[PDB]
Amino acid sequence: AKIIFVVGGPGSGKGTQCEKIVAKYGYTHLSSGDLLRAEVSSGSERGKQLQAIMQKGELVPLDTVLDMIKDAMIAKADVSKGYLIDGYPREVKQGEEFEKKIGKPCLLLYIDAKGETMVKRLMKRGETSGRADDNEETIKKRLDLYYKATEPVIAFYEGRGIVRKIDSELPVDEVFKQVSTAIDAL
Ligand SMILES: Nc1ncnc2c1ncn2[C@@H]1O[C@H](COP(=O)(O)OP(=O)(O)OP(=O)(O)OP(=O)(O)OP(=O)(O)OC[C@H]2O[C@@H](n3cnc4c(N)ncnc43)[C@H](O)[C@@H]2O)[C@@H](O)[C@H]1O
């Protein structure tokens, strides 16, 4: 099965575009954030540790996140012709371990938004839906961690030759036209 990585800053639009891909193309959307949140909601001790980390806007350890992604991919293996890995990898080492333990991606959709745009989007969502990490201080930390840890992922996969940059400043449907062009070109 094809493995597509979807990487971009917090609030850039990764989840939105992934849900569009699912509806049009039928790939399996796995979200690292949603997996981690599902553990938090289980009430486990592990979930309590993850909630603490996520609330602070820091990165969860690679071992826990990659486990859960692998767990989810195995659970869907029967029925998936492709996977969208949304929000993983977030550092170069995550990408390398994923390739060692699972397989190589065929495409990286780089969901590119401006920093100010991301702040605005996450503040709006936080005011609405109240996700715990959508508060101003945590937003700032998430964005700074993205620039520091995650942009080198984009460089790594530029070196591999598989990055397609998606202008996520446009309206949702215009972003998805770019996304669709990239996927149709595989
Ligand atoms: N691999 C990893 N390693 C270690 N730790 C990890 C990890 N993965 C996760 N974690 C941990 O878990 C935390 C959460 O990670 P995760 O949940 O993956 O959150 P994120 O990167 O913080 O993503 P969001 O879901 O905040 O953004 P999105 O880019 O999907 O934007 P969306 O489409 O929702 O859109 C945002 C909003 O904007 C709107 N919007 C989208 N596109 C547009 C558009 N084109 N125009 C106008 N509005 C738009 C949406 O409607 C919505 O309101 C991390 O901070 C970390 O602690």
Q: From CA 96, how far away is CA 180, in angstroms rounded?
A: 27
CATH number of the domain encompassing residue 136? 3.40.50.300
* Alpha-carbon 69 to chain mean position: 11
The boundaries of the domain holding residue 180 are 1-186
The residue nearest atom 36 of ligand 1, judged by CA position, is 11
In this structure, what token pair is assigned to residue 32? 């690292």
One-letter amino acid at 111 equals I
Which residues line ligand 1 at a C-beta cut-off of 6 Å? 8, 10-16, 31-33, 36, 53-54, 57-60, 65, 87-88, 90, 94, 121, 125, 133, 142, 168, 171-172, 175
In total, how many domains does the chain have?
1
CB atoms within 10 A of CB 136: 11
- Determine the distance separating the centroid of ligand 1 and the alpha carbon of 46, expressed in angstroms: 22
Q: What is the resolution of this structure in A?
A: 1.9
Token pair 């109240």 in the structure block, residue: 130
Q: From CA 179, how far away is CA 70, in angstroms rounded?
A: 25
